[PDB]
Design a protein around this nucleic acid. Structure first.
Ligand SMILES: [Mg+2]
Ligand SMILES: [Mg+2]
Ligand SMILES: [Mg+2]
Ligand SMILES: [Mg+2]
Ligand SMILES: [Mg+2]
Lengths: 205, 134, 260
RNA sequence: CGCGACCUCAGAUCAGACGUGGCGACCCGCUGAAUUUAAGCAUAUUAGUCAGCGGAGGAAAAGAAACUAACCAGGAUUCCCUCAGUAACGGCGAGUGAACAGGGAAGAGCCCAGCGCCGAAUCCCCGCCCCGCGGGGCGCGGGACAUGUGGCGUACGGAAGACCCGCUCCCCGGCGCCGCUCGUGGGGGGCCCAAGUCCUUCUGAUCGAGGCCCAGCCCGUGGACGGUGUGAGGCCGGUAGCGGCCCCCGGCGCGCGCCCGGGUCUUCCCGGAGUCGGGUUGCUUGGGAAUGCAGCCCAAAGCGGGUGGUAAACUCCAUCUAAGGCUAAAUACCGGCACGAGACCGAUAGUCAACAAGUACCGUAAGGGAAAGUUGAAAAGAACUUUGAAGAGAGAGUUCAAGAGGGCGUGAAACCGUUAAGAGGUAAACGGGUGGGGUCCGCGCAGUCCGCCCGGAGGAUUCAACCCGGCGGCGGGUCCGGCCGUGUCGGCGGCCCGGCGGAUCUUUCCCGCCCCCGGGGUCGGCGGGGGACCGUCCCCCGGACCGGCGACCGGCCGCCGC
RNA sequence: GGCGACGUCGGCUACCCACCCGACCCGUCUUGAAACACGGACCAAGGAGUCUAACACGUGCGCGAGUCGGGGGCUCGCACGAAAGCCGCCGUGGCGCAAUGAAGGUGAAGGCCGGCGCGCUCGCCGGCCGAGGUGGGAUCCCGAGGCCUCUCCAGUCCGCCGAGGGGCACCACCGGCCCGUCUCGCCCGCCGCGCCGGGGAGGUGGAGCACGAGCGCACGUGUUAGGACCCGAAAGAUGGU
RNA sequence: GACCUGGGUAUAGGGGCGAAAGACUAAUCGAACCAUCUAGUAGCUGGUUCCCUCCGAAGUUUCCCUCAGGAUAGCUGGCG
RNA sequence: GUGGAGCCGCCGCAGGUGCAGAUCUUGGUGGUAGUAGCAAAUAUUCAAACGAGAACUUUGAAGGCCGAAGUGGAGAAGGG
């Protein structure tokens, strides 16, 4: 059943497979169906934008992916706390809330606190009957457009430092090398043992 | 060119709505034109035919200039019978023959109260399109 | 057929009885009682390879070839030979890139937009199209395609102000927006050189939409109009040049037949 | 003992309600084989599928972490692309085989028990009337439940009370109604462009040809269908943010009904058990020193518990808060009620069925289950005369055709009948070479060469030869007017009123940051926003060579037509 | 050069007949068919290498150290449009550009000249360069010489050209480099002096480098998983009458 | 006479029933019938549909629960 | 020649694309062939009738068999 040189093959068709198959003869029909549910939804509601709330800025989980920025889930309260808005007020204003999200940095915390007040800067509200509790005049002179698109404040913005040019100094060109890693790794798998060999000198008495 | 999606274009289906058509829709598809003068007095194009209208026969074996009323309108077999056009059988008995009313000209109508509401509504709705061009 | 011929309980008769070993249906009574059941051989049988709906219907062509093949389909609409050798009759018409002004798009009643086609003498082609109103040869006449129709010119435009109305009743004609072109409608049958009528607002955009060789295009991101493998393409002007006929051996024109 | 309160209970054709059954395409729970592959075959595979059993819905299931991670941390579920035919499992053989990252579709969140405060502030039924539709309510009185605990506030993201301080009186459904509806909502019925005008063919036109200079006519209508044959115009109708007519949808404003949130400080409260886990046994998974599931035994604790993918002990840390509950979209649909389309099949095909098809018929029964379309435009479906008792004829008649005569269009081959031509002891038939006969074909018939040139003869024209008059081309011409190729610069000319880039350059520039004792030091960079500069394509003058399919002009030679 | 019609001229086909010669009935497995091997009475229609998944190579095309939108999105509420076009601050991803080890991990540059530390077989500094070298090697270059009507006064050209040069791809070979290891010897470093790091010289194992050729699409062939070229069992299991 | 028989009634598929023969259990019995998994599997038979052109074999070696089979090497064409 | 409404060249594309065989499937027809056969239970004959038509239908006469555990008279089951 095999012949002259070729791949060895395990094709997974020993199981019954012709009674579960899924031809996508409706994937054009499902694309222009779920465009009607974006046409006749984003006009049906409001001058509120399409594509949902403001999402915060979020840095990725894998070592592979920690260098990059992603539209996360919700500002996890603290960003509602340093910026100072009420949590059940926030999700009717148009601000997403994700309570099980934590903050264990101060660098990333203020990165959304300015973002939230920046959203609150570019927000205009409609008071019901124009007595205006804590909203200004005529509707920002007008609503200027009907709907906004693909995210409020461009949630990617994968910005990068310029770091233009420098003069190599004395300390920078002599030290920071490969041997600073082989001894760095040697204080990762020869550190706990050297805690134990100093216990040998405290029991030598 | 047809742009309305919810109506057919296939030969094998408009025949099924034609040969198996209900019998009051069937009087609509058996409709005859009005004559060249009589479409200008009553300013309307064509009409569903009925039992006491005298008209000449235009395309067939029996062509032209024999104005004489119809006698019986077989809706089922898409055929009217006109009092002049007949055929001697092999018996010597004379029977009518059938001619489809889209090959037939009304040269005088019968009017009643129900036809005036047709000859008004079908005539009002042509000067609707003439006043589209304001 | 979803499941044809297998909707039948049958088996081989097995033993002797002087019959072939095809499966026979069971029972008694009716006619279809001992006949040959499923198998491509038999009447009322499942066909060989009952076709599946998951044939690879749709094909891929990568985008740069779809853009190479449509640069190559517009340039053949400029040469006075290729657009006549396809079948379009541009015999009495002026300049092959027919460009009319933007006032065509304000046509809203087709009495107007026909004597556009007459005054440009482009009506010598639609007079041919009425002749090609035949009926289909074969068994297509019951699959609701019945009338063959020779394709005519295509008016290519942008910013419709009614021209999609007063041209969509003329037979054989096609109207395609100069933003969103189509290789299938610029070359009917894969035979290059369909005749086209342009418009000022359409004809000017192609320098900024397919670009040139000097720059790139601005309405497509990563495209430049492709390279031309022959700079000087007429070899009859090349093979009769003094660089070559200085270098050649000589011609050699005796016949030297078979000597007895 | 008799009466009574309860507790566990019965009985009823008590009053009023409820559940079973059908379908099962998709969904949920459970039970679940073998053929097959391994070239044998026990593990494995086929497969957690087929069958069986039960549950529902227009979707169901799933769901707001007892998570994934181990770095700069993500953040309910579901689905698709990738992860990946990879880790891992396996007579480590055959073969099976996830998930996290990451990009998208959609993105909605919440409730309770418990610990506590409020004098059950809770609910059902019954009767009356408020007053309103086709009915549901707050009132008014009477029977229950319930203290073995109803209702408000409350949920782990913290909460509650007392303070203190600074803002604010809302929201909620309905109501007869008036104005919009988004394709302008949905459903229903009746309407809306233009030729039969002339000739002509046919049995019949829908065919052929014609319609002066406006192209016979209408085109937002040339899709399709029937109509005696091929029809934009003869008719249904196609087109149109076309009209009018009827019925129903979500969203005005009087009379309803509920109706104080916010930040700090102080104190107080803070959680689901035969459950978690362990031992063993079966199934299962890629889960491998047991991933899930279930049985039986042992059975928890509170700085406790679950998890951290190699058994275990110690030691830190990371994350999470279980044994209680609801929830829209994204998703699945070979059953149905409707639809639309097809590089489909076209009566031995396509479903089993184009037709009185799950019908005739068979079997005791489960169950098996067909063959079968066409006269013609119109039945005009043969009146009538004649032989026969009739079946059937022969005449006559209809129609374009009975060479279409009631399973009747086209009518093939095998096979049969007769006529005709030929032939006959090795069965016939075949291959090769002729001969003889015939049917017919052309040839067409001692009647076949045909076109150029030239010399004769009659016969009748008219350009040529020459030239001006002529509109048009070809060929080289000074590129003189307009041309474009690649460049140097300049005018940066529009850069600060070009276009686009560049991980070029810009702490003296523009606010909001961190650092530093009501303000400063750029005090270094941030988020943001300029403008200086490089590279490349746009107007101008100068410079390059051919003025090339980039062409008009005049000038010339040499054509050509009238 | 010569000869002839109203029945005569030329000609065959799937026409018939006669004759001479050669001639056993096809399909099929098989060393061996006409076989006393088997299927075939005769016609009509139906009837058997398919479709997907995957890999290989061949070839065609587009782009090329890259490539590819397949999954989403945008573009009136449009027949053909279930198309086509566009995105790129949708390149996430896939395959490729880097290999090797069980793994922790590590991870592919030389050539010359000057000179120096005891040029110790061992070693080091400055510069130019830069994929090393031997042999073949199509092509290209130089080319002595040869080439024309009288002997000198010369030119682009052409024509063979002995030798000699720069030598593409590829082949044989020697040398180097990366990684795993093995043997042998000293040297250097210090986010902090150790059962730490880095190293050199020879020998070997590798699906490697030594100036990249891949990806996508399409087609053909081959091999497999699929009812898998059509038709064929004795059986097996589940649920029923 | 352990006799013959109508009707009623009981037992069902690895089950029933048997004065035993592997009989009988709806013309079927050393495991019934029907539908499904199912188009189950076969190294074994039968078949395999147009013409011309060009090239044109092998039944041998090694290994296999291998001997009617495959692998491999050989012979062969196609592309260069 | 029959027949009465469709069809084909060329350039591309796409297949359910070609039959002499499968004890092939389905429909059709032959040689056999006017042949095997219409032979279990004894057996029919004459005239008249209605009839276009008489061995077989009816009527009569005669000769027969079944022969009371019937080739007789009535039923249950089954058939409709
Ligand atoms: Mg045909
Ligand atoms: Mg329901
Ligand atoms: Mg048929
Ligand atoms: Mg691909
Ligand atoms: Mg069994």
């Amino acid at each position: 059943a095999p012949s002259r040189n070729g791949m060895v093959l395990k094709p997974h068709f020993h199981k019954d497979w012709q009674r579960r198959v899924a031809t996508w003869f409706n994937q054009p029909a499902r694309k222009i169906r779920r465009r009607k549910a974006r046409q006749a939804k984003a006009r049906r509601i409001a001058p509120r934008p399409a594509s949902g709330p403001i999402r915060p800025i979020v840095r990725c989980p894998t070592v592979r992916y920690h260098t990059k920025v992603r539209a996360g889930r919700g500002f996890s309260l603290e960003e509602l706390r340093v910026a100072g808005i009420h949590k059940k007020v926030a999700r009717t204003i148009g601000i997403s809330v994700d309570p099980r999200r934590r903050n264990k940095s101060t660098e990333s915390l203020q990165a959304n606190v300015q973002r939230l007040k920046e959203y609150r800067s570019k927000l205009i509200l409609f008071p019901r009957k124009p007595s205006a509790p804590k909203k200004g005049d005529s509707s920002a002179e007008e609503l200027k457009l009907a709907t906004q698109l693909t995210g409020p404040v461009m949630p990617v913005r994968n910005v990068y430092k310029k770091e233009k040019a420098r003069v190599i100094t004395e300390e920078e060109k002599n030290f920071k090398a490969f041997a600073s890693l082989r001894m760095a790794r040697a204080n990762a798998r020869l550190f706990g043992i050297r805690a134990k060999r100093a216990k040998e000198a405290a029991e030598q008495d | 060119m047809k742009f309305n999606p919810f109506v057919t274009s296939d030969r094998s289906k408009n025949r099924k709505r034609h040969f198996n058509a209900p019998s009051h829709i069937r009087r609509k598809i058996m409709s005859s034109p009005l004559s060249k003068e009589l479409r200008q007095k009553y300013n309307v194009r064509s009409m569903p035919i009925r039992k006491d209208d005298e008209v000449q026969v235009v395309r067939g074996h029996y062509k032209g200039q024999q104005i004489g009323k119809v006698v019986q309108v077989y809706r089922k077999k898409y055929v009217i019978y006109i009092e002049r056009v007949q055929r001697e059988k092999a018996n010597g008995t004379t029977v009518h023959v059938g001619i489809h009313p889209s090959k037939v000209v009304i040269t005088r109508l019968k009017l009643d109260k129900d036809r005036k509401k047709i000859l008004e509504r079908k005539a009002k709705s042509r000067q609707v399109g003439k006043e589209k061009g304001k | 057929s979803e499941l044809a011929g297998h909707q039948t309980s049958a088996e081989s008769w097995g033993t002797g009885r002087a019959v072939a070993r095809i499966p026979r249906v069971r029972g008694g009574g009716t006619h279809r009682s001992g006949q040959g059941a499923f198998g491509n051989m038999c009447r009322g049988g499942r066909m060989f390879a009952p076709t599946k709906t998951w044939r690879r219907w749709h094909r891929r062509v990568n985008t740069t070839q779809k853009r190479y093949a449509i640069c190559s389909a517009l340039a053949a609409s400029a040469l006075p030979a290729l657009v006549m050798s396809k079948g379009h009759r541009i015999e009495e018409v002026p300049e092959l890139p027919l460009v009319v002004e933007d006032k065509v798009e304000g046509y809203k009643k087709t009495k107007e937009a026909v004597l556009l086609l007459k005054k440009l003498k482009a009506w010598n082609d639609i007079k041919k199209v009425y002749a090609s109103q035949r009926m289909r040869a074969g068994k297509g006449k019951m699959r609701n395609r019945r009338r063959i129709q020779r394709r005519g010119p295509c008016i290519i435009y942008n910013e419709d102000n009614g021209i999609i109305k007063a041209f969509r009743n003329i037979p054989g004609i096609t109207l395609l927006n100069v933003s969103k072109l189509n290789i299938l409608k610029l070359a009917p049958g894969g035979h290059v050189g369909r005749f086209c009528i342009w418009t000022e607002s359409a004809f000017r955009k192609l320098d900024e939409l397919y670009g040139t060789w000097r720059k790139a295009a601005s309405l497509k991101s990563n495209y430049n109009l492709p390279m031309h493998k022959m700079i000087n393409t007429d070899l009859s002007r090349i093979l009769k040049s003094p660089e070559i006929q200085r270098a050649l051996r000589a011609p050699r024109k005796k016949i030297h037949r078979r000597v007895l």
